[PDB]
Design a binder for this molecule. Structure first.
Ligand code: HEM
Length: 82
Protein backbone atom coordinates (compact mmCIF):
# COMPACT_ATOMS: atom_id res chain seq x y z
CA UNK A 1 0.00 0.00 0.00
CA UNK A 2 0.83 3.69 -0.34
CA UNK A 3 2.53 5.18 2.77
CA UNK A 4 0.87 8.56 2.34
CA UNK A 5 -2.59 7.00 2.35
CA UNK A 6 -1.64 4.84 5.32
CA UNK A 7 -0.39 7.89 7.20
CA UNK A 8 -3.88 9.33 7.04
CA UNK A 9 -5.97 6.15 7.33
CA UNK A 10 -4.15 4.59 10.24
CA UNK A 11 -4.52 7.77 12.32
CA UNK A 12 -0.78 8.64 12.40
CA UNK A 13 -1.76 12.14 11.24
CA UNK A 14 -3.42 12.78 14.59
CA UNK A 15 -0.10 12.70 16.47
CA UNK A 16 2.56 13.38 13.85
CA UNK A 17 3.57 15.84 11.15
CA UNK A 18 6.67 15.74 9.05
CA UNK A 19 8.16 19.13 9.90
CA UNK A 20 6.73 19.94 13.30
CA UNK A 21 6.31 18.08 16.55
CA UNK A 22 2.74 17.46 17.66
CA UNK A 23 2.11 14.65 20.11
CA UNK A 24 4.95 12.52 18.82
CA UNK A 25 8.19 13.59 17.06
CA UNK A 26 8.37 15.16 13.62
CA UNK A 27 9.24 12.65 10.90
CA UNK A 28 12.15 14.78 9.64
CA UNK A 29 13.68 14.49 13.13
CA UNK A 30 13.18 10.75 13.22
CA UNK A 31 14.74 10.34 9.82
CA UNK A 32 17.62 12.52 10.89
CA UNK A 33 18.31 10.45 13.99
CA UNK A 34 18.09 7.11 12.33
CA UNK A 35 20.03 8.65 9.48
CA UNK A 36 21.53 5.71 7.68
CA UNK A 37 21.81 3.29 10.58
CA UNK A 38 21.90 -0.37 9.65
CA UNK A 39 18.66 -2.16 10.51
CA UNK A 40 16.71 0.98 11.43
CA UNK A 41 13.80 0.18 9.15
CA UNK A 42 13.02 -3.11 10.86
CA UNK A 43 13.44 -1.51 14.23
CA UNK A 44 11.14 1.39 13.51
CA UNK A 45 8.61 -0.96 11.95
CA UNK A 46 8.42 -2.91 15.17
CA UNK A 47 7.93 0.23 17.24
CA UNK A 48 5.22 1.53 14.92
CA UNK A 49 3.33 -1.70 15.32
CA UNK A 50 3.87 -2.59 18.94
CA UNK A 51 4.34 0.79 20.52
CA UNK A 52 7.23 2.92 21.78
CA UNK A 53 8.25 4.84 24.91
CA UNK A 54 11.32 6.70 26.16
CA UNK A 55 13.13 7.46 22.91
CA UNK A 56 11.73 10.95 22.32
CA UNK A 57 10.23 11.68 25.71
CA UNK A 58 8.27 10.06 28.57
CA UNK A 59 4.95 9.57 26.77
CA UNK A 60 4.17 6.41 24.84
CA UNK A 61 3.11 5.75 21.33
CA UNK A 62 0.27 3.23 21.85
CA UNK A 63 0.25 0.09 19.65
CA UNK A 64 -1.14 0.73 16.18
CA UNK A 65 -3.75 -1.16 14.16
CA UNK A 66 -1.32 -1.90 11.36
CA UNK A 67 -0.05 -5.13 9.86
CA UNK A 68 3.60 -6.06 9.58
CA UNK A 69 3.72 -5.15 5.93
CA UNK A 70 2.02 -1.84 6.63
CA UNK A 71 4.50 -1.02 9.39
CA UNK A 72 7.44 -1.71 7.08
CA UNK A 73 5.98 0.54 4.42
CA UNK A 74 5.48 3.34 6.90
CA UNK A 75 8.93 2.93 8.47
CA UNK A 76 10.58 3.15 5.09
CA UNK A 77 8.62 6.29 4.23
CA UNK A 78 9.45 7.98 7.56
CA UNK A 79 13.12 7.35 7.00
CA UNK A 80 12.94 8.94 3.60
CA UNK A 81 12.00 12.23 5.20
CA UNK A 82 15.74 12.98 5.51
C1 HEM B 1 0.64 5.60 12.43
C2 HEM B 1 0.57 4.10 12.21
C3 HEM B 1 1.91 6.08 13.12
C4 HEM B 1 3.22 6.00 12.64
C5 HEM B 1 3.66 5.45 11.31
C6 HEM B 1 4.06 6.45 13.66
C7 HEM B 1 5.44 6.39 13.64
C8 HEM B 1 6.29 6.73 14.67
C9 HEM B 1 7.66 6.68 14.61
C10 HEM B 1 8.46 6.28 13.39
C11 HEM B 1 8.14 7.01 15.87
C12 HEM B 1 9.57 7.00 16.31
C13 HEM B 1 9.83 5.70 17.04
C14 HEM B 1 11.27 5.63 17.51
O1 HEM B 1 12.02 6.56 17.25
O2 HEM B 1 11.80 4.45 17.51
C15 HEM B 1 7.04 7.35 16.64
C16 HEM B 1 7.09 7.81 17.94
C17 HEM B 1 5.99 8.22 18.68
N1 HEM B 1 4.69 8.22 18.26
FE1 HEM B 1 4.00 7.58 16.52
N2 HEM B 1 3.30 6.86 14.71
C18 HEM B 1 1.98 6.67 14.38
C19 HEM B 1 0.90 6.98 15.19
C20 HEM B 1 0.97 7.55 16.45
C21 HEM B 1 -0.13 7.96 17.19
C22 HEM B 1 -1.59 7.82 16.83
C23 HEM B 1 0.36 8.66 18.27
C24 HEM B 1 -0.44 9.51 19.23
C25 HEM B 1 -1.39 8.75 20.13
C26 HEM B 1 1.73 8.51 18.27
C27 HEM B 1 2.58 8.96 19.25
C28 HEM B 1 3.94 8.80 19.26
C29 HEM B 1 4.77 9.17 20.31
C30 HEM B 1 4.35 9.88 21.58
C31 HEM B 1 6.06 8.75 19.97
C32 HEM B 1 7.31 8.87 20.81
C33 HEM B 1 7.65 7.56 21.51
C34 HEM B 1 8.97 7.69 22.27
O3 HEM B 1 9.66 6.68 22.42
O4 HEM B 1 9.25 8.77 22.98
N3 HEM B 1 2.09 7.89 17.12
N4 HEM B 1 5.93 7.18 15.90
Amino acid sequence: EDPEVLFKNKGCVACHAIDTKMVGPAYKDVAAKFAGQAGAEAELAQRIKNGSQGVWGPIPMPPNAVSDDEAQTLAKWVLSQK
